[PDB]
From Swiss-Prot, chain B:
Tissue-specificity statement: Mainly expressed in roots.
Residues of the full protein shown: 60 to 358 of 360
Enzyme Commission (EC) number: 2.5.1.-, 2.5.1.1, 2.5.1.29, 2.5.1.10
GO process annotations (BP): carotenoid biosynthetic process; farnesyl diphosphate biosynthetic process; geranyl diphosphate biosynthetic process; geranylgeranyl diphosphate biosynthetic process
Function: Catalyzes the trans-addition of the three molecules of IPP onto DMAPP to form geranylgeranyl pyrophosphate.
Protein name: Geranylgeranyl pyrophosphate synthase 3, chloroplastic
Gene: GGPP3
Residue sites binding dimethylallyl diphosphate per the record: R95, K176, T177, Q214
Annotated Mg(2+) 1 binding sites: D84, D90
Length: 278, 270
């Protein structure tokens, strides 16, 4: 984790993509009347984010030869779903967070009822937004495949199952595979689909995204024991040293999925794995 | 007279094939499903999946072809019931004499179960129907379902309901009741191979029917129609809604139209 030129480039990449994503999200949920609805939806959606999921979607679409523009509504859709899951996670019945990124959580602003409902609205808006924009830009069979992939990433085979179970090691990887990886996989596969890429590229980048998600969760535990005096985790299941080994194996596994792609087009995803691992 | 009894039998038949399909759609065999099935298979009138099927048949389609869309609109209906029962909203301990979802599984599981049903509606409808219909229709079906649920659909209705009269009330009823019925009907026309012009007619029918339901419910009960516009004008609104619904059924064979005429009647004469 040493090459600073690619890190500088990627830092700039992140800022630019996040800016583009924030503009498109702002436009995706217009401040139109009835404000009661739109405001509660917008509050959590337009709060500051690293936007790694829509960024991954965009980067993958570019990798296989596509444009940011073409990938943007799918990218926004995955950020909407991710936002919905955060709203419900923060709820008193679940995590009971007062704060999110330093700012009051949704239910703390609008009430619990409104927060539940806002989560529901965001789930529906993802499918609507993605389909209504993307259907004009890709073959209808691809559009249908995109809808299926999104829906599957959300459900009993994806995000919701992972949330429910989160209430030995194989269990921890189950949680991480479902809460984090499924929606990242969705983001990457939607990237390939929106970029006109092949079935092979779809599975390669699905694998890439799975590695990236797992890597994020391992590195999160490492960072916590490494920087919280209080600190079920990887360093307490298999040690801190082996935890770092696992992180590094995951990162190299992600990187190998990008072999044979155009170096230039591959650079942001190489750098994304490096950024996460360090 | 007898025609209403025929419709009763019709509803019972369609409901039982919908219940079968719903059972199959959330396979109990796990690795979550239990919380979902508990509310989804609890039993209802299944009026929205019936509307979907009846409308598919109307335009010359099959029950089998519309069944996944019908199940999807029932999953969405079921989702909104689970979320409505929650402590933070209607705080109901019971539903049809039976404990509500959060009372069996906890509020967190209930919330999650609602979210799962929302995703499963899209996955199930799209995987099965795509399937049986041209891809452009499938796409349009996804857009209609999505539009019925959110900020211009059911959730908008719920949010505004949490809060002088007629504009507000019509908004709530149109979004909280009508939007999803409209989805059921339009999905019926789409899966049935019907035309755009049949779509608009049946969207209109579903709308009249949903509104009719709420107006008649307010009339039976003597922020309502009779207090905002009077009892007399409420009965007038009910009658023109009923008849508006029937006029959408012009141009179809009487026999195929019969269950939708009968459903309009059944909502009118409660």
């Amino acid at each position: 984790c040493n090459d600073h030129n690619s890190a500088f480039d990627f830092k700039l990449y992140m800022i630019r993509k996040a800016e583009s994503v924030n503009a498109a999200l702002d436009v995706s949920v217009p401040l139109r009347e009835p404000l009661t609805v739109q405001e509660a939806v917008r509050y959590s959606l337009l709060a500051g984010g690293k936007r790694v999921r829509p960024l991954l979607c965009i980067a993958v679409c570019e990798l296989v030869g596509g444009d940011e523009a073409t990938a943007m509504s799918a990218a926004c859709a995955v950020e909407m779903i991710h936002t919905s899951s955060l709203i419900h996670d923060d709820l008193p019945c679940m995590d009971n967070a007062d704060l999110r990124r330093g700012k009051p959580t949704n239910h703390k602003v609008y009430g619990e009822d409104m927060a539940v409902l806002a989560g529901d609205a965001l789930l529906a808006l993802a499918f609507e937004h993605m389909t209504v924009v993307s259907s004009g830009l890709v073959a209808p069979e691809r559009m249908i495949r995109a809808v299926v992939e999104l829906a599957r990433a959300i459900g009993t085979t994806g995000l919701v199952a992972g949330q429910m179970i989160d209430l030995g090691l194989e269990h921890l990887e189950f949680i991480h595979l479902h809460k984090t990886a499924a929606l990242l996989e969705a983001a990457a596969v939607l990237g390939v689909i929106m970029g006109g890429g092949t079935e092979e590229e779809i599975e390669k980048l699905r694998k890439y995204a799975r590695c990236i998600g797992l890597l994020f969760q391992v590195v999160d535990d490492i960072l916590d024991v490494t920087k919280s005096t209080e600190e079920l985790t990887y360093p307490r299941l298999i040690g801190l040293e082996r935890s770092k080994e696992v992180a590094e194996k995951l990162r190299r596994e992600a990187e190998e999925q990008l072999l044979g792609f155009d170096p230039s087009k591959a650079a942001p995803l190489v750098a994304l794995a490096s950024y996460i691992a360090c």
